[PDB]
Write a protein that binds this ligand. Structure first.
Ligand SMILES: Nc1ccn([C@@H]2O[C@H](COP(=O)(O)CP(=O)(O)OP(=O)(O)O)[C@@H](O)[C@H]2O)c(=O)n1
Ligand SMILES: [Mg+2]
Ligand SMILES: [Zn+2]
Ligand SMILES: [Zn+2]
Lengths: 69, 49, 1340, 99
DNA sequence: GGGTATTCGCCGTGTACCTCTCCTAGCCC
RNA sequence: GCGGAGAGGUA
DNA sequence: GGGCTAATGACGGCGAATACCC
């Protein structure tokens, strides 16, 4: 289990819209419109989206550019 | 019932006021209580029968 | 579901009520009790409210869904879904127009003052004893004349016409319909323009505001009287049939039936034209029934059938705890939730919790079904259900797989603060008890003695992310109240670590050299070395001294085996020193603190877990126990007790002879017993503390003992010195019921045995303690509820408002020393402006910077004493606060994030800890320093004293490097010794004054001259012989004799020649009005020395905190000065002496009456400052705010509360008290004019934005000056903008009535409203959402 | 004691309180305050509507969970509608406005 | 009559949970 | 058989 | 059973309504 989200909050310092972007990503992941960019280790889609956020691949702007594309 | 107790901390399984107990206690069947529930079914007389 | 906003409330007009209603309920019957079909007409009626069963009529002609609008011809019931029976309302046509109880009996009787008629008269009318003549035409009778029975009779017989009187609520409605709102409103404004008197102007302004509200809102007054009465949908007031032909019904059914009965009987009587008396009785009865329906309890309390308890009416359903808002709209009952007993589970990670299999399956049932169907193990949902009810291995495998990353919420019954709810990852376990991680117990206040916890499951994806991110145990390590860690090891862990680190003079393996901790463990676990034994070890510590790089320094330290064993866990960045000490509770806590400050969150979490595991393990290996011999009776106890008994015997015998009063003997005995108690305690601590006289190789030595109870004391695991005393010493003094202390103490201790008396006494003590805790908890709960309620809507909305205002914060140095230092007081606050070194143009902190640890240490290196920091109270932002004005402090370390609801965190942090809340002769400098006097103007006299002539004089202490250590307040008339510059030795007496005596000090010399001090009229010369004794009595105003009532004796201070010497610089003729009880002992004829005695003049805890936060006038408030300047007397002895403050510049006409009993601290010819004390006593916050202003009142409240809180040793950051205070003073009162109504109480936010709009406009237009007001949280919450917030917890009837009459419109704007309506709170994760919605209106 | 879904109450369509009947835990006002102290808006929202009080919301959420998707549709709590009806039963007109 | 006291009456008084009995009543046909 | 009283108990 | 009818043991705070004192 991912015991700390400290690096994800260091990516976006509000610590609140972090939850929103991670929820949007994990909702695009659960209802299978999209695919994970990280090799999953039997995590559920919430911890997958946090693991993706902490690695710098996804934020709000990447979501907006990919959605309009 | 009166049992052999030892006052010591045992890897924090008795951390707070919690109590540690030996399998011998359940084996010797010394803390098993019998309880008894009562249930009632009542057949009344309705006007439909 | 529609997307809505703005809930509007107003009076219901009878046509609107008819609009809502679907039918009339004519008969009160509901159902046939024999066949359970509803009545054809009745409180439950299918043709009015709806079909009982979905899509089928009553008689059964039409039952199919094909028909959706048809209304059966036989039974007039339409075929639709039974759910509609939940929303359709009915109505009753009343024969006699009836009054709405809410608009009548609510404390401000709005019918009463709207009609400008006192409540007493309306009551006289409503109970039908007398008439009132409403517009009696051209006769000799006024419009509000009360008439008795036979006066009405003779009047009617004499005056057949031009006589209009009527009775009852219909009469009142007649009065309401005929009122001209606008004409009376304008007349009232003219009257206000003509009238200048306080109380009438207040009643007039209230009434004018009411009239304006009606003419703006569009409500017509006549609607307060009911003609049609709506009836609640049936399913909301059910009549459920109990098994056994009997029925169970809500009380509303009874009330409605009674109302219908009285209505129908009145109808028949009207059709029969019965005499007036009988119809009046029937109308009265209908009144009782209806008003019992609306609000039962404002009358003779119409009780229920055969139960003696008053039945619950609609108002009762809404108002109150048990009823509604509290119960069902803020206190719901979620699904996917469980409860069970909590258990230890040491093996857990900090971020997880043991969860029983069966509850987990039950909770996650739908998840199980979904996953089972995805994997294809079940064809359909019912097969999934059957598979869960058999519970096969596949189900447990799916549960393990689904549970993997899904977090659950754990809650403990009294959720005092936000750490009462935390998220954990569950681990499936056997058993029926929930397993809780030990470290978090402190946060939950959880104990494993039958405490239970509830477990909720977050369902949606956003909820899961929120639980794991915001609420998870590991994310909450710092308390939101103060920055310190919450998860500190509690008792077993700290005991184990303590055992591990303490050293012993001699053991196995003394002084052998180890290459590292790993071979230390090799030695200890193999039994080749003691767990504690002094040893030299080579250790490599890491230090991040560079820009985040770790540098290994490796050297030989002298430590114990145990300290090495502990060092294995410690992460890289920490200095070895941390573990090198005894490692008690404090040491471990500060260890965690440093680990957090240096490394960050994740290492701190893992380090805490490691600490727990090692502590538990080695506590178990220690084998610490408690035997009867572990508590050592001090050897010299018996001697001490026998000696104290002999001493008490000598003092009692020496009392029986009568050289000492009873009280004095009491004091002596109590003090000698206290001394004996301290003696025995110290003897016991010496015996127990360092008693291990164990031998090294040769000679002996002595060391801090290894007595298990002593280790339990010193480590801070359990027990305090007091309880050790209570075990092995004499258990001190006790308090009897009334608080008086018993003369003989309890000499025995629990190791020994008490006897009946000593036990009995301690029983009283414990009983009182328990009762205290109970009542204390109730009061706490109430206080915290008010706090969270008042401050809920406050949110951090803006990043920086950009104001320059701020409060100059200093360290509160109460008397002897620095109770609370600067660094903690300023940490995490942004600065209001750059502070300069002691040398100008040496900027130490740029414009607003967050003051983190590094800045605080930098300030320590310099000698900054006071720092102006931006405070939330002075923040400029409209409708919330800005990040900068608040600061950083949180469970996390960084600056506050936009959107966070700081009001609730502040209120919770102030409330939760509130459950443990219950001579001055010489000054003595504590540390050697320079003396400095502040706010004083002295004049050296002939005796050589620095005479104090200021009442606000302070004597602070500057140290070597310019810092104020000690501070005292020196009053008028205290003899001084050292002046300015002198260095004072430790504990040296610098000042002197009489405790029970305030002397009046003369400024100049010369002869005492008697003026208006005539002998015989007001004074009686009773004088003694040569030695100069007298009893000349200058009595005060109250005690002056009957003849000397108006003649005021005076003493003018003249010199040796006769001329009155004038105060330096002033022309004032010194005319000294001798104050109360002036005993002129020193008669005329003795050269006065400088310092002659003229006149001898002989709560805390939870209630104090609640009173400070409610701003309660303490029934004897001190009085202050408004402007400065020469004060003067006036028209004498009217019953309250007049004081007129004359400003040297400003206008004179400010008079203040003063009661006779009041003693004055200032002389007439004195120089007062605004808001200086005139009378002694506790000051009510309102005056301080009004005179001195915002920063003064806020500092006063914050300091006064923080004093109570620190007295108990509970640390709270001031920001929370500040946030509450800011919520308190939300309102202002307008003094000028220009855009408002010139007197309306209006929130400071709207007033400020009106000024901002004028500034935004290029034209200056009108700007109106406003004065701040401070209101206590109860009233302050009552005067909130949103009416749902106020209605949520207070008198529902009052606020509901106010908002109904005012036509108020709620934009919800807050947290509690949004909660109630079930949409996203504007705080935190939802802030963006609401901000988004803000953009959604008035956009494309 | 634990429950996923079961019988709900008559007047305010919240789940029964108790152990004899399945019954849910009481998420009281103090717990609401706890959630508000965090920025936890969605958790509180579902706890307030989808978990207890919103009828259509609760059934839609059951179906959605069964479908293996985790979203929600908060709606307005039924108890609030009961509140409107009870206040409206007095002589007080309280309407949900729209613009 | 106008300001000040005094009586007077209403409103509030912690959360979560767990057992049990008892639930419209009286009189007349 | 949803409710509410009364009694007791838990933390 | 079914049918018909309908007293005394809190306490504090606050604000409005008289009681009364000049
Ligand atoms: N009337 C009551 C009595 C108790 N409680 C609850 O029981 C606990 C008292 O702990 P406590 O501090 O009083 C005893 P404990 O925590 O075990 O430490 P100690 O034994 O070493 O002194 C708190 O959680 C209270 O909320 C309550 O809500 N109402
Ligand atoms: Mg406990
Ligand atoms: Zn039909
Ligand atoms: Zn600001």
């Amino acid at each position: 289990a991912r015991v700390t989200v400290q690096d994800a909050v260091e990516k976006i310092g509000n610590r609140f819209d972090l939850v929103l972007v991670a929820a949007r990503r994990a909702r695009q992941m659960q209802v299978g419109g999209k695919d994970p960019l990280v090799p999953e280790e039997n995590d559920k889609t919430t911890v997958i989206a946090l693991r993706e956020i902490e690695e710098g691949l996804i934020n709000n702007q990447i979501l907006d550019v990919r959605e309009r594309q | 019932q009166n049992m052999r107790v030892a006052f010591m901390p045992w890897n924090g399984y008795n951390f707070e006021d919690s109590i540690l107990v030996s399998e011998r206690v359940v084996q010797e069947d010394r803390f098993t209580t019998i309880h008894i529930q009562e249930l009632a079914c009542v057949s009344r007389d309705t006007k439909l029968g | 579901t529609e997307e809505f906003d703005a809930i509007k409330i107003a009076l219901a007009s009878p046509d609107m009520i008819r609009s809502w209603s679907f039918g009339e309920v004519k008969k009160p019957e509901t159902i046939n009790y024999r066949t359970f079909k509803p009545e054809r007409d009745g409180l439950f009626c299918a043709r009015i409210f709806g079909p009982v069963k979905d899509y089928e009529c009553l008689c059964g002609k039409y039952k199919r869904l094909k028909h959706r609008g048809v209304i059966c011809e036989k039974c007039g019931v339409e075929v639709t879904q039974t759910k509609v029976r939940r929303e359709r309302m009915g109505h009753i046509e009343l024969a006699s127009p009836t009054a709405h109880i809410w608009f009548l009996k609510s404390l401000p009787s709005r019918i009463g003052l709207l009609l400008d008629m006192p409540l007493r008269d309306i009551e006289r009318v409503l109970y039908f004893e007398s008439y009132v003549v409403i517009e009696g035409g051209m006769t000799n009778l006024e419009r509000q004349q009360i008439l008795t029975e036979e006066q009405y009779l003779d009047a009617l017989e004499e005056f057949g016409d031009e006589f209009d009187a009527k009775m009852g609520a219909e009469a009142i409605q007649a009065l309401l319909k005929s009122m001209d709102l606008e004409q009376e409103c304008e007349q009232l404004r003219e009257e206000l323009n003509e009238t200048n008197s306080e109380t009438k102007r207040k009643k007039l302004t209230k009434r004018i505001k009411l009239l304006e509200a009606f003419v703006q809102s569009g409500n017509k007054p006549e609607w307060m009287i009911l003609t049609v009465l709506p009836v609640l949908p049936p399913d909301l007031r059910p009549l459920v049939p109990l098994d056994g032909g009997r029925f169970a019904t809500s009380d509303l059914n009874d009330l409605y039936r009674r109302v219908i009965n009285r209505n129908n009987r009145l109808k028949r009587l009207l059709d029969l034209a019965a005499p007036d008396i009988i119809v009046r009785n029937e109308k009265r009865m209908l009144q009782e029934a209806v008003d019992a329906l609306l609000d039962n309890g404002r009358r003779g309390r119409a009780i229920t059938g055969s139960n003696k308890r008053p039945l619950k009416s609609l108002a009762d359903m809404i108002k109150g705890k048990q009823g509604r808002f509290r119960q069902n709209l803020l206190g719901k009952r979620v699904d996917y939730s469980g409860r069970s007993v909590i258990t230890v589970g040491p093996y857990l990670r900090l971020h997880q919790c043991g969860l029983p299999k069966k509850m987990a399956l039950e909770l996650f049932k739908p998840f199980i079904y979904g996953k089972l169907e995805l994997r294809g193990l079940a064809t359909t949902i019912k097969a999934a259900k059957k598979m869960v009810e058999r519970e096969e291995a596949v189900v447990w495998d799916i549960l393990d797989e689904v549970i993997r990353e899904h977090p659950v919420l754990l809650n403990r019954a009294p959720t005092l603060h936000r750490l009462g709810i935390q998220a954990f990852e569950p681990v499936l376990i056997e058993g029926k008890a929930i397993q809780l991680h030990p470290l978090v117990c402190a946060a939950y206040n959880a104990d494993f003695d039958g405490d239970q916890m509830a477990v909720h499951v977050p369902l949606t994806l956003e909820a899961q992310l929120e639980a794991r991110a915001l609420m998870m145990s590991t994310n909450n390590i710092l308390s939101p109240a103060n920055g310190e860690p919450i998860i500190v090891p509690s008792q077993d862990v700290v005991l184990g670590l303590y055992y591990m680190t303490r050293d012993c003079v001699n053991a196995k393996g003394e002084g052998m050299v180890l290459t590292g901790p790993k071979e230390a463990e090799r030695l200890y676990r193999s039994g080749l070395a003691s767990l504690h034994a002094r040893v030299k070890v080579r250790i490599t510590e890491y230090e991040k001294d560079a820009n985040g790089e770790l540098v290994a320094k490796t050297s030989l330290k002298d430590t114990t085996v145990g300290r090495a064993i502990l060092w294995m866990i410690v992460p890289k960045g920490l200095p070895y020193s941390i573990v090198n000490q005894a490692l008690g509770k404090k040491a471990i806590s500060k260890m965690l603190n440093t680990c957090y400050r240096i490394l960050g969150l994740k290492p701190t979490v893992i380090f805490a877990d490691q600490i727990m595991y090692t502590g538990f393990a080695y506590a178990a290996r220690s084998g610490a126990s408690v035997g009867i011999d572990d508590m050592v009776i001090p050897e010299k106890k018996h001697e001490i007790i026998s000696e104290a008994e002999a001493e008490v015997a000598e003092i009692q015998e020496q009392f029986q002879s009568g050289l000492v009063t009873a009280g004095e003997r009491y004091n002596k005995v109590i003090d000698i017993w206290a001394a004996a108690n301290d003696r025995v305690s110290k003897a016991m601590m010496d015996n127990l503390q360092t008693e291990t006289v164990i031998n090294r190789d040769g000679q002996e030595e002595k060391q801090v003992s290894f007595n298990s109870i002593y280790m339990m004391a010193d480590s801070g695991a359990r027990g305090s010195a007091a309880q050790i005393r209570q075990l092995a010493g004499m258990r001190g003094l006790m308090a009897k019921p009334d608080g008086s202390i018993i003369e003989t103490p309890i000499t025995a201790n629990f190791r020994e045995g008490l006897n009946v008396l000593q036990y009995f006494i301690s029983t009283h003590g414990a009983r009182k303690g328990l009762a205290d805790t109970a009542l204390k908890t109730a009061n706490s709960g109430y206080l915290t509820r008010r706090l969270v309620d008042v401050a809920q809507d406050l949110v951090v909305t803006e990043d920086d408002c950009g104001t320059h205002e701020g409060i100059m914060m200093t360290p509160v140095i109460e008397g002897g020393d620095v109770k609370e230092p600067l660094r903690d007081r300023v940490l995490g606050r942004v600065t209001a402006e750059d502070v300069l070194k002691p040398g100008t143009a040496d900027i130490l902190v740029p414009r607003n910077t967050l003051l983190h640890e590094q800045w605080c240490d930098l300030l320590e290196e310099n000698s900054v004493d006071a720092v102006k920091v931006r405070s939330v109270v002075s923040c400029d932002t409209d409708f919330g606060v800005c990040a900068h004005c608040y600061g950083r402090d949180l469970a996390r370390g960084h600056i506050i994030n936009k959107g966070e609801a700081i009001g609730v965190i502040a209120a919770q942090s102030i409330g939760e800890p509130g459950t443990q809340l219950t001579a001055e002769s010489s000054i003595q400098v504590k540390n050697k320093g320079s003396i400095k006097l502040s706010n004083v103007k002295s004049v050296v006299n002939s005796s050589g004293k620095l005479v104090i002539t200021s009442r606000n004089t302070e004597l602070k202490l500057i140290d070597e490097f310019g810092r104020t250590k000690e501070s005292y307040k020196v009053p008028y008339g205290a003899v001084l010794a050292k002046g300015d510059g002198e260095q004072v030795a430790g504990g040296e007496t610098v000042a002197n004054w009489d405790p029970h005596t305030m002397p009046v000090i003369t400024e100049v010399s010369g002869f005492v001259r008697f003026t208006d001090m005539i002998d015989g009229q007001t004074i009686t010369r009773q004088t003694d012989e040569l030695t100069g004794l007298s009893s000349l009595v200058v009595l005060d105003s109250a005690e002056r004799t009957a003849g000397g009532k108006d003649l005021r004796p005076a003493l003018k201070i003249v010199d040796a020649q006769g001329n009155d010497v004038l105060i330096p610089g002033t022309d004032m003729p010194a005319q000294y009005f001798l104050p109360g009880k002036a005993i002129v002992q020193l008669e005329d004829g003795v050269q006065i020395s400088s310092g002659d005695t003229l006149a001898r003049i002989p709560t805390g805890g939870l209630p104090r905190v609640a009173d400070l936060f409610e701003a309660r006038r303490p029934k004897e408030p001190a009085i202050l000065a408004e402007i400065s300047g020469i004060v003067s007397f006036g028209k004498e002895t009217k019953g309250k002496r007049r004081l007129v403050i004359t400003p040297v510049d400003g206008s004179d006409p400010y008079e203040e009456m003063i009661p006779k009993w009041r003693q004055l601290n200032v002389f007439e010819g004195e120089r007062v400052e605004r808001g200086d004390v005139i009378s002694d006593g506790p000051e009510a916050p309102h005056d301080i705010l009004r005179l001195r202003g915002v920063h003064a009142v806020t500092r006063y409240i914050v300091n006064e509360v923080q004093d109570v809180y620190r007295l108990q040793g509970v640390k709270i950051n001031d920001k929370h008290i500040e946030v509450i205070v800011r919520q308190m003073l939300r309102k202002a009162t307008i003094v000028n004019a220009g855009s408002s109504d010139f007197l309306e109480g209006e929130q400071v936010e709207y007033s400020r934005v009106k000024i901002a709009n004028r500034e935004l406009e290029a034209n200056g237009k009108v700007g109106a000056t406003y004065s701040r007001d401070l209101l206590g949280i109860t009233k302050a919450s009552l005067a909130t903008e949103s009416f749902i917030s106020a209605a949520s917890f207070q008198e529902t009837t009052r606020v509901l009535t106010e908002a109904a009459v005012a036509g108020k419109r709620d934009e919800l704007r807050g947290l509690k409203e949004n909660v109630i309506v079930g949409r996203l709170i504007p705080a935190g994760t939802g802030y963006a959402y609401h901000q988004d919605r803000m953009r959604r209106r008035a956009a494309g | 004691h634990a429950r996923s879904t079961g019988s709900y109450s008559l007047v305010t369509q919240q789940p029964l309180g108790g152990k004899a009947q399945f019954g849910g835990q009481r998420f009281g006002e103090m717990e609401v305050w706890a959630l508000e102290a965090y920025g936890a808006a969605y958790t509180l929202q579902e706890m307030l509507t989808v978990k207890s009080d919103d009828v259509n919301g609760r059934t839609k959420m059951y179906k959605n969970i069964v479908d293996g998707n985790h979203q929600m549709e908060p709606g307005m709590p039924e108890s609030f509608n009961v509140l409107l009806k009870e206040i409206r039963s007095l002589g007080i007109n309280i309407e949900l406005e729209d613009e």
